[PDB]
Amino acid sequence: SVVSIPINNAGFEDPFIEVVDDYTVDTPPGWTTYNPNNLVPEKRTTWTSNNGVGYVGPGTQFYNQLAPEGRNIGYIYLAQKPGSGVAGFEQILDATLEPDTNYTLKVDVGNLAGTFKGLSFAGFPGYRVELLAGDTVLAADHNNLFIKEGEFKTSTVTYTSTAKDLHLGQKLGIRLVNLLQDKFSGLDFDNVRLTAEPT
Amino acid sequence: SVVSIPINNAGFEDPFIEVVDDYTVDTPPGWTTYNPNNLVPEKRTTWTSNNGVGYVGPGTQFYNQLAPEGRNIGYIYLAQKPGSGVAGFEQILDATLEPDTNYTLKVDVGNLAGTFKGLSFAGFPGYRVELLAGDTVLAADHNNLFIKEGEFKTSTVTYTSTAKDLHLGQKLGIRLVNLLQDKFSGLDFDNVRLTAEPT
Amino acid sequence: SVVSIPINNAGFEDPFIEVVDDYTVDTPPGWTTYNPNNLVPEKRTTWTSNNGVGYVGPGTQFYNQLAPEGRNIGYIYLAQKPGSGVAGFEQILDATLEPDTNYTLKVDVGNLAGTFKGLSFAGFPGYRVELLAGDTVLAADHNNLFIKEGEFKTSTVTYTSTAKDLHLGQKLGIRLVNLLQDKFSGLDFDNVRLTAEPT
Amino acid sequence: SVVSIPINNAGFEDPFIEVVDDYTVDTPPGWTTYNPNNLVPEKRTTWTSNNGVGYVGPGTQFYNQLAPEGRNIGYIYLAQKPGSGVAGFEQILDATLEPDTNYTLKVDVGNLAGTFKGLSFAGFPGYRVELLAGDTVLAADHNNLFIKEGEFKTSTVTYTSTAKDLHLGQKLGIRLVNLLQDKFSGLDFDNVRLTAEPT
Ligand SMILES: CC(=O)CCc1c[nH]c2ccccc12
Ligand SMILES: CC(=O)CCc1c[nH]c2ccccc12
Ligand SMILES: CC(=O)CCc1c[nH]c2ccccc12
Ligand SMILES: CC(=O)CCc1c[nH]c2ccccc12
Ligand SMILES: [Ca+2]
Ligand SMILES: [Ca+2]
Ligand SMILES: [Ca+2]
Ligand SMILES: [Ca+2]
Ligand SMILES: [Ca+2]
Ligand SMILES: [Ca+2]
Ligand SMILES: [Ca+2]
Ligand SMILES: [Ca+2]
């Protein structure tokens, strides 16, 4: 009776990227930029904070594995110094919070590795994965997993609704957040999945 | 190889309380009131927002069990309506963040049950347990456990430091947070423990 | 007496670039990539050898002046080590080599300055500017100017045709070449101009 | 603070030639034959590519002036058709490239005029003058000057070293190149001078 809640572009496979380690610098289709501190500008460049999709394919210089799912990951890179705020991806779903339901949200989180011409990718900014109803964070994993350089790990967030939950009927949502707690302050997400099961 | 990090009044056993289901309305010794939204006044009653310790002893009216540890729990009760903000307890420790270390923070979180003077304690405000270095939240459990009316369940929060962590040498800290996401908007904590071991 | 020979996209003003210091990684329209050593890949990323246009605008991090002309410059960046070859821009013109004519080719050449997060732009690869007829290099300036970090200088290349020049009647051409003699091995060009004067 | 850099046989005065318009067919002492395309054979004759020195003295048949310097010039004659490659003279010096130094190389380049035994010396193959460090061309004048039939003109090549030049400490060199871009495909050089000056 476990049911899949549809998420748009849940594995960041849109758009198709042809070249390994190439990437876009526009919000991935189906998602919005979560930007409570306005860290990410509307027009992004190499020199600014940005997010988008990237192709982790054979020959990749960033990971010791391929993408958790398909070709692509979704990334958020913050140029501002640690402590400046947070940003990432948000998506509000069509499904709504239902009573006496177990919700299970899984997302792979990646720590990009390596080096480019004096730029180091060592380090990680921390992550948070949030399940929302309306604009309440029902449950979140704030940086509990250790993610080695050049790997992805699956974050799992759980929530059980009761028959009289205040947020019943409000739209579900997901946020994938770069915490900007350290540098290199880029991190990746992939393979977002949300299931619901009668309790 | 697992080491205990000292925490003051980690079980809220101070002060001693004589009578079952009695309680204080002042910040527990060794803790401060985490009050980022000004919900808890300096001068409390039983009918303002408050915090304190409570004796969950034999035949308690609020739980199906005794305190997780010793006689007492620590409680936070917020009178303001859901969504007004958060508050709880904070303690800054003497130990500082060390590299290549796996930190494990555990706290028992209680969901009060029953009905007292015509007030129902049905419902739960949501919790967050935070592990700090300095004023940074390294890791947190934001409301992932499902806690039935009248029971405690253990929250586990984990952080792994690296060799170059920006926060090395900063004081470790703990926050125990009432999220005020619903009513009844009181919750309990007990048996705070923090360990460290080589990664 | 002196006539301007038209050149397409002679100031790299196509495409339009909105944000200061942003750039493209594709061959600018009207030009081709001069690629005698195959150093520049057909499909470029931020990480590969590349060419394109770059907006040298108010508040540029790269120069102590604005673009020699308009908004943009044309750049060629080579990732391969010094000595691996050359690459740049080429444009074959409609104009043909006429007798008893003094040709004067000028181009501004830029030595990009600064740093970004560990990337260093100190150093300069060397330049060569070539005037062609057909496949023949009639005249060239191979790296005679000294160009300080963060400025542009005008290179001038001259050829005088005789009554019975072998190449008479063949199409004129221009090449702008990154010599890859040192690092940082990026350099910029702007404001290409070619004049013809009967002798 | 400008200094002369010693060059051997810098005016091609060795060997002494007694009879006006007589010449040698062997590589001038102190120079080597620059031969990247094998156009000049080890054993030279009448109908072969050759180099040598030539006495441009009173009443010379080939010029409207005496030699730029002393009695002789150095010549390079290439018998192969235009486009077959290049050849000329090379000399590696004892001086090495030093930092923060302005180098100025000057060379007189000659366009032979007239007739010799029913053969027209009209036309000119083009020249290139190169300053080297090791086997890197630091700077060159590729054919920028216009040289009338029967005259010499001074080519000036300049290079400026920085503190961190990749080629620091390598031996300076000079190349004087016949480009074989047209016929009559002989040219002459004289009076090679190289100066260095702290920048
Ligand atoms: C290097 C960055 O943090 C931004 C680009 C990026 C972040 N993650 C990626 C995965 C595959 C290709 C590109 C990327
Ligand atoms: C009803 C409250 O939230 C305040 C008192 C209280 C909160 N939790 C308790 C546990 C044992 C005894 C008293 C208490
Ligand atoms: C920094 C590089 O070498 C490639 C991009 C680039 C080279 N030159 C530039 C001028 C303005 C904006 C960007 C550029
Ligand atoms: C074109 C030639 O006669 C080859 C020898 C030569 C080339 N240039 C010269 C000038 C004076 C005397 C002889 C020569
Ligand atoms: Ca994917
Ligand atoms: Ca990393
Ligand atoms: Ca206790
Ligand atoms: Ca309750
Ligand atoms: Ca321009
Ligand atoms: Ca530079
Ligand atoms: Ca001489
Ligand atoms: Ca001639």
Short mmCIF file of N, CA and C in Angstrom, two decimals, chain B residues 41-123:
data_model
loop_
_atom_site.label_atom_id
_atom_site.label_comp_id
_atom_site.label_asym_id
_atom_site.label_seq_id
_atom_site.Cartn_x
_atom_site.Cartn_y
_atom_site.Cartn_z
N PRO B 41 8.94 34.76 28.78
CA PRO B 41 9.30 35.93 29.58
C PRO B 41 10.27 35.60 30.73
N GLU B 42 11.00 36.62 31.20
CA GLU B 42 12.00 36.44 32.25
C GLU B 42 11.27 36.03 33.54
N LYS B 43 10.07 36.59 33.72
CA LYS B 43 9.24 36.32 34.85
C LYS B 43 8.05 35.48 34.39
N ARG B 44 8.02 34.23 34.88
CA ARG B 44 7.08 33.23 34.42
C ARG B 44 6.02 32.97 35.49
N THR B 45 4.86 32.50 35.04
CA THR B 45 3.93 31.80 35.90
C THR B 45 3.70 30.39 35.34
N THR B 46 2.70 29.70 35.90
CA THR B 46 2.11 28.48 35.31
C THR B 46 1.31 28.77 34.02
N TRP B 47 0.94 30.03 33.73
CA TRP B 47 0.07 30.32 32.55
C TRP B 47 0.74 31.19 31.46
N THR B 48 1.98 31.64 31.68
CA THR B 48 2.80 32.17 30.59
C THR B 48 3.48 30.97 29.91
N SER B 49 4.17 31.21 28.79
CA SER B 49 5.18 30.28 28.35
C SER B 49 6.18 30.12 29.50
N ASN B 50 6.70 28.90 29.68
CA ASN B 50 7.68 28.68 30.73
C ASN B 50 8.53 27.44 30.44
N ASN B 51 9.54 27.25 31.29
CA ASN B 51 10.31 26.01 31.30
C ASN B 51 10.75 25.76 32.74
N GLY B 52 11.30 24.57 32.96
CA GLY B 52 11.57 24.10 34.29
C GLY B 52 11.79 22.61 34.29
N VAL B 53 11.74 22.02 35.48
CA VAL B 53 11.83 20.59 35.63
C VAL B 53 10.53 20.08 36.25
N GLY B 54 10.22 18.81 35.98
CA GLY B 54 9.03 18.16 36.49
C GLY B 54 9.37 16.75 36.96
N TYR B 55 8.73 16.33 38.06
CA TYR B 55 8.97 15.00 38.63
C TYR B 55 7.96 14.03 38.03
N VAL B 56 8.47 13.14 37.17
CA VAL B 56 7.67 12.10 36.56
C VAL B 56 7.92 10.82 37.37
N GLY B 57 7.23 10.72 38.50
CA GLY B 57 7.40 9.64 39.44
C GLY B 57 6.21 8.68 39.49
N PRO B 58 6.18 7.76 40.47
CA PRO B 58 5.21 6.66 40.47
C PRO B 58 3.76 7.16 40.41
N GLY B 59 3.00 6.61 39.46
CA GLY B 59 1.60 6.97 39.24
C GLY B 59 1.40 8.31 38.54
N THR B 60 2.43 8.80 37.84
CA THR B 60 2.31 10.08 37.12
C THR B 60 1.04 10.06 36.26
N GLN B 61 0.35 11.20 36.21
CA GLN B 61 -0.86 11.36 35.40
C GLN B 61 -0.54 11.62 33.92
N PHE B 62 0.73 11.89 33.55
CA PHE B 62 0.97 12.43 32.18
C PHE B 62 1.61 11.43 31.21
N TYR B 63 2.10 10.29 31.72
CA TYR B 63 2.89 9.34 30.94
C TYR B 63 2.47 7.92 31.31
N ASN B 64 2.77 6.98 30.41
CA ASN B 64 2.61 5.57 30.62
C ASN B 64 3.88 4.95 31.21
N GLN B 65 4.86 5.77 31.61
CA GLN B 65 6.16 5.31 32.10
C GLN B 65 6.73 6.35 33.08
N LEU B 66 7.72 5.97 33.89
CA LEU B 66 8.50 6.91 34.70
C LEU B 66 9.41 7.77 33.80
N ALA B 67 10.15 8.72 34.39
CA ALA B 67 11.15 9.52 33.67
C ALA B 67 12.09 8.55 32.97
N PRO B 68 12.60 8.87 31.76
CA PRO B 68 13.65 8.06 31.15
C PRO B 68 14.82 7.82 32.11
N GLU B 69 15.13 8.82 32.95
CA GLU B 69 16.27 8.75 33.80
C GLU B 69 15.93 9.50 35.09
N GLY B 70 16.27 8.88 36.22
CA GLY B 70 16.05 9.48 37.53
C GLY B 70 14.60 9.83 37.79
N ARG B 71 14.42 10.95 38.48
CA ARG B 71 13.11 11.41 38.88
C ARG B 71 12.48 12.37 37.86
N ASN B 72 13.31 13.24 37.26
CA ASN B 72 12.80 14.46 36.64
C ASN B 72 13.04 14.44 35.13
N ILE B 73 12.21 15.24 34.46
CA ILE B 73 12.40 15.68 33.10
C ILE B 73 12.55 17.20 33.09
N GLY B 74 13.01 17.73 31.95
CA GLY B 74 12.94 19.15 31.68
C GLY B 74 11.81 19.43 30.71
N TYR B 75 10.99 20.45 30.96
CA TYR B 75 9.88 20.74 30.04
C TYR B 75 9.97 22.18 29.52
N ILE B 76 9.37 22.39 28.34
CA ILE B 76 9.15 23.68 27.74
C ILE B 76 7.69 23.73 27.28
N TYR B 77 6.97 24.75 27.74
CA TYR B 77 5.58 24.97 27.36
C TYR B 77 5.45 26.39 26.78
N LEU B 78 4.90 26.46 25.57
CA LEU B 78 4.73 27.72 24.85
C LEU B 78 3.23 28.03 24.74
N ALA B 79 2.85 29.21 25.23
CA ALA B 79 1.46 29.60 25.31
C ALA B 79 0.99 30.22 24.00
N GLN B 80 1.93 30.77 23.23
CA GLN B 80 1.59 31.47 21.99
C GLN B 80 1.04 30.48 20.97
N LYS B 81 0.38 31.00 19.94
CA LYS B 81 -0.27 30.14 18.97
C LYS B 81 0.76 29.49 18.05
N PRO B 82 0.43 28.34 17.43
CA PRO B 82 1.36 27.63 16.54
C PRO B 82 1.90 28.55 15.44
N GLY B 83 3.20 28.46 15.15
CA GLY B 83 3.83 29.31 14.13
C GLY B 83 4.45 30.57 14.71
N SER B 84 4.29 30.84 16.01
CA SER B 84 4.81 32.09 16.59
C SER B 84 6.34 32.11 16.71
N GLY B 85 7.00 30.95 16.60
CA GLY B 85 8.45 30.82 16.78
C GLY B 85 8.80 29.59 17.60
N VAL B 86 10.03 29.55 18.16
CA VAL B 86 10.47 28.39 18.92
C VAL B 86 11.16 28.87 20.20
N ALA B 87 11.30 27.95 21.15
CA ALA B 87 12.09 28.20 22.31
C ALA B 87 12.46 26.84 22.91
N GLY B 88 13.44 26.85 23.80
CA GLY B 88 13.71 25.67 24.57
C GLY B 88 14.87 25.86 25.52
N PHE B 89 15.76 24.86 25.56
CA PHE B 89 16.92 24.89 26.44
C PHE B 89 18.19 24.93 25.59
N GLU B 90 19.25 25.53 26.15
CA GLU B 90 20.58 25.58 25.53
C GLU B 90 21.60 25.39 26.64
N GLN B 91 22.66 24.64 26.34
CA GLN B 91 23.83 24.60 27.19
C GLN B 91 25.07 24.58 26.31
N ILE B 92 25.99 25.50 26.62
CA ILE B 92 27.31 25.49 25.98
C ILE B 92 28.26 24.68 26.86
N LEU B 93 29.02 23.77 26.24
CA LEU B 93 29.89 22.86 26.96
C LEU B 93 31.30 23.44 27.04
N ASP B 94 32.12 22.80 27.88
CA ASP B 94 33.53 23.14 28.02
C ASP B 94 34.38 22.47 26.94
N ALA B 95 33.95 21.31 26.44
CA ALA B 95 34.71 20.63 25.42
C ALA B 95 34.51 21.37 24.09
N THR B 96 35.55 21.35 23.25
CA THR B 96 35.49 22.01 21.96
C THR B 96 35.52 20.97 20.83
N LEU B 97 35.13 21.40 19.62
CA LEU B 97 35.09 20.50 18.46
C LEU B 97 36.50 20.05 18.08
N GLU B 98 36.66 18.73 17.94
CA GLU B 98 37.90 18.09 17.62
C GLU B 98 37.80 17.45 16.24
N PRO B 99 38.91 17.38 15.47
CA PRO B 99 38.87 16.81 14.13
C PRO B 99 38.74 15.28 14.13
N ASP B 100 38.32 14.75 12.97
CA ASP B 100 38.24 13.29 12.70
C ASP B 100 37.52 12.57 13.84
N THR B 101 36.39 13.17 14.26
CA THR B 101 35.65 12.64 15.38
C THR B 101 34.19 12.48 14.96
N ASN B 102 33.60 11.36 15.40
CA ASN B 102 32.19 11.06 15.29
C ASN B 102 31.52 11.42 16.63
N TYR B 103 30.67 12.46 16.59
CA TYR B 103 29.87 12.89 17.73
C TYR B 103 28.47 12.27 17.64
N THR B 104 28.00 11.77 18.79
CA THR B 104 26.67 11.20 18.93
C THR B 104 25.98 11.87 20.12
N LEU B 105 24.90 12.59 19.81
CA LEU B 105 24.07 13.27 20.79
C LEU B 105 22.74 12.52 20.87
N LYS B 106 22.37 12.11 22.08
CA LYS B 106 21.12 11.44 22.32
C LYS B 106 20.34 12.20 23.39
N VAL B 107 19.02 12.29 23.17
CA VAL B 107 18.09 12.87 24.09
C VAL B 107 16.77 12.11 24.01
N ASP B 108 16.16 11.84 25.17
CA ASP B 108 14.79 11.30 25.20
C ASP B 108 13.79 12.45 25.17
N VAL B 109 12.80 12.33 24.28
CA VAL B 109 11.84 13.36 23.99
C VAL B 109 10.47 12.80 24.36
N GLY B 110 9.70 13.56 25.16
CA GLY B 110 8.44 13.10 25.70
C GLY B 110 7.25 13.87 25.14
N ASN B 111 6.19 13.12 24.82
CA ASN B 111 4.91 13.64 24.39
C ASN B 111 3.88 13.45 25.52
N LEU B 112 3.57 14.52 26.25
CA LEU B 112 2.66 14.49 27.42
C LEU B 112 1.27 14.01 27.02
N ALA B 113 0.63 13.22 27.88
CA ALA B 113 -0.72 12.75 27.59
C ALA B 113 -1.65 13.10 28.76
N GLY B 114 -2.95 12.91 28.53
CA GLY B 114 -3.90 13.06 29.61
C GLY B 114 -4.60 14.40 29.53
N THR B 115 -5.27 14.75 30.63
CA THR B 115 -6.26 15.83 30.70
C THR B 115 -6.23 16.32 32.15
N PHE B 116 -5.94 17.60 32.36
CA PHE B 116 -5.63 18.11 33.69
C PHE B 116 -6.26 19.49 33.93
N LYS B 117 -7.37 19.49 34.69
CA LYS B 117 -8.13 20.68 35.03
C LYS B 117 -8.93 21.13 33.80
N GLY B 118 -9.43 20.16 33.03
CA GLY B 118 -10.17 20.38 31.78
C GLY B 118 -9.28 20.70 30.58
N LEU B 119 -7.95 20.70 30.76
CA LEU B 119 -7.05 20.91 29.62
C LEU B 119 -6.66 19.53 29.07
N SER B 120 -6.81 19.34 27.76
CA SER B 120 -6.27 18.16 27.09
C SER B 120 -4.80 18.40 26.73
N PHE B 121 -3.95 17.41 27.02
CA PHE B 121 -2.58 17.38 26.54
C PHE B 121 -2.45 16.55 25.25
N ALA B 122 -3.56 16.27 24.55
CA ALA B 122 -3.47 15.60 23.29
C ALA B 122 -2.74 16.54 22.31
N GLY B 123 -1.98 15.94 21.39
CA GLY B 123 -1.21 16.69 20.37
C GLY B 123 0.21 16.96 20.86
#
